[model samples]
Target: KLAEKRPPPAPRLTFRPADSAADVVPIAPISVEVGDGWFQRVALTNSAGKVVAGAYSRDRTIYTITEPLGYDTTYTWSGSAVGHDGKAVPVAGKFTTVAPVKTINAGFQLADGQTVGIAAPVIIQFDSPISDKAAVERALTVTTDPPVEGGWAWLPDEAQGARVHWRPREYYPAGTTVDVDAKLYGLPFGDGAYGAQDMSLHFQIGRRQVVKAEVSSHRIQVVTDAGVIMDFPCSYGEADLARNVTRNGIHVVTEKYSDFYMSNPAAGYSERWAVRISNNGEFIHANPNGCINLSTENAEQYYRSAVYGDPVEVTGSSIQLSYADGDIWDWAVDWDTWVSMSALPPP
Candidate 1:
């Protein structure tokens, strides 16, 4: 009698990295391809039985992990497949993901549950320099009530660090609620670094107060959408010199201090009672040189009325505000340039 012939081995499922492969990046999606068979059921799980979420192709010939895997961890996939003959085949495999040695930290300038001025940009400071600026920006999510238009720009700040500020193409509408979520966890931050954790901030915009300060008349007219509220006299930088000339353009109120110590060594006097409107040391404050009288009860009223993010339009001055003064001087540029500065793509 002749020896009986045996059939060929059945086709097996194949994975991208093969079973037991080490040093795979966690961010890369895991793939499983079936050969001469259809995936009947498939599941991926870690050592602790934490399963990875995945999906199957319409034809059931492939499976892919939907979410990122954890670092320095091993995961096992087990399931069954059906071959051309409709015979059941058991499948199992394991792989490890790469681990990160460094992590990036992010800090926020605005706090949760706090009200800020319309000009107050959503500031984010990274502890380390970010090589992938766009990736970092994508991680930040900003939402507004009443839905305002806005975008973010990268502003160079400290050495080995960077700052990103989000400003509306115009001013934030008063009473708008803002929510920011920095979904940074498990995010790849370039150079094999990942985000240390995630963060969030919630704040609101308060009353609207736009101060129209006309340098020609030396008077500031305060108004809201409602109507004109207050009008007062003001002073500009001396006209004799270029540096002393007040900037002519729209300025946003960045900060307010009951007593702001301002000094220009060349100007001689260090003064107090300042409401800062521009980043270049300009303020609507009492000048010891008699520029403006913050001492009067009326001036006091203007000072008390100020809020962060308020717009102070300064016109009729010899020197116009420029980007050299500050990135916050963004509005001083033409509307075209203002829109161009945004990192966001046009809708």
Candidate 2:
């Protein structure tokens, strides 16, 4: 019989997610390292036979996963590598991702292409509580036209788990354009939770319009960055035992309704042309009792100029905006109070 031939030894290598196959988080990065050789060709696929995206090191000694992985899934990887000794070796492995019971969705305050007031800040509300705040903050990006200095601060929510907001140290410059990108895909949020999807918002700042409406003065002074525009006589909440007096604070115009029906069942007035300042039913609208001009040309003009984030400063009233009023009520709160709500300590 002829002499039998023997095969050479396989090349040595190290693959991550080791320990005879282990489970990892969905966002876990995959990698491979060779001992005395380089990768010739490597392929990794999911349970569905879809190839996992990845790249090799310049020297071909290492390969890493570049794309996010799915939860509770199995992945099989295999390839051939070239040993320094000029021999071909086989590489193969399998790993699984941990199944998550919770995930979060983030929603924005401004609509794309919408124009907002300078005082308006970018706000995002989360569907779940965020224990890993820094991780989430790092993924939230706000790019501005003129490059203003700003920071994000956490805000408490009454209905949701949490809310985060970003604002310039001062009001944004008039005509500034803002682009907000939330790269939340596969992001670890905390409590074994991950982001549900990516989200974005684009909004611009319009000409500065600040309305200083004083209850006692019965006037709404409209001012712009240039100068005082006009002072229109206005009516605040009725002064009575019912105490329907308007709140005194810095309020932002969030929504505009040309024919909004205003009503106070207890105060006994139902009217229209309402521009909402806070969610607790306060508005810069026509009062059936105090001023009719606010219902005609004045109200129409205000409505025409109204954009999201426009400031409606209400003063000279007994009632003040409270946290229960709206999402952006932080504007009316003291600076110290606002800072206290942040997740990270102040600088």
Candidate 3:
């Protein structure tokens, strides 16, 4: 009579998505747990009865699905749990993945395996505006060889939803390897949309090529690890006006065109060995407006040696380069200021 009066308690089962739930995020982990018992077989299947693959915990009290679930699809779970009472409890649940209102894609400025200058900042641009900056920034990762220190800051959003740039505290050492990963798939962008897919890039830091542009001196100084490579007498912005005077600040080389047709309103176009440094009308080319001019041999020489991502430091000018100068303005801000712009700030 005493033994029959109190028997061991039966196991209690719980599912993550819960029974008959709807609008769950597709990538949410599917799982089931039991208290005071162990699972025999916890199985989750789609509408067609295809079993989802999962593994049980060491204690066997919890089971979690390993694969991703499809959007707008229904899934059901069936399992059994047993306790000391010698009674087996059954587990059952059903849930549906939500259909996202929109999805966003991330674009990278650097290509995989591309080598760039020391000062080039790795940029990740989103196709849609992201309301949650921290959430998206958490999904991005950067790794570097020889242990480089850097921080990512959210740049002002453009036509794209959001933008971020990664800059090292100091210029990158030559021949350093860098890897970036954006684990964006299925993640809610903290907005109404989700990430479309994941992305990754592996690039390297090239030689230490730097261009020292002094507007008043009318010379383009090129330097490398070996020291001063060339000091070409070249024309910079010829106009004393802010627009025409080479803006003081760092200008990174983005492109080198052998025969670029540059045009202004007064004239049509002229072919030159142009090294484009800014989106604005700025180039270390054969000639400049007003009176600044460079020898054909010197212009061609500079163009041939110039590489993408190199910084052209334009000092001794009235106006300073900024985002308004166009394309890349990563170097416009001081290192301390750049650190402040991070969605996830440094401790």
Colliding pairs, model 3:
128-161, 129-161
- Candidate achieving the largest TM-score: 2
Model 1 misses residue 81 by how many Å? 15
Candidate 3 residue-wise lDDT, 1-347, digit = tens: 35657666778887898988888887887899998899987899999899989999889989998988876789998878888777788888899987677888888998998999988889898888888888888988999996799999998899866889998887889889999999887788865688887899999999999888788887878999989999887776656555666767887888877887766632455757877777776777775342224687787898898777888888877777788877777887788888888887676
Provide the clashing-pair count of each candidate structure: 2, 0, 2
Number of the candidate with higher TM-score, 1 or 3: 3
Model 2 lDDT tens row, 62-156: 89998888877888888889875697888788888777668788898778998888889898989878888988888978899999877788866
Off by over 4 Å in 1: 1-102, 262-270, 288-293, 343-347
* Candidate number that wins on TM-score, 1 or 2: 2
lDDT of 1 by residue, 316-339 (tens): 777778866774575676656655
> Looking at model 2, which ten-residue stretch has the lowest summed lDDT?
286-295
Q: Which lDDT values do the candidates have, in the order given? A: 0.75, 0.77, 0.82
Error of 2 at 82 (Å): 1.8
Give the runs in model 3 whose Cα sits over 4 Å from its true position.
Answer: 1-11, 35-40, 47-52, 78-91, 262-268, 288-293, 344-347
Error of 3 at 248 (Å): 1.0
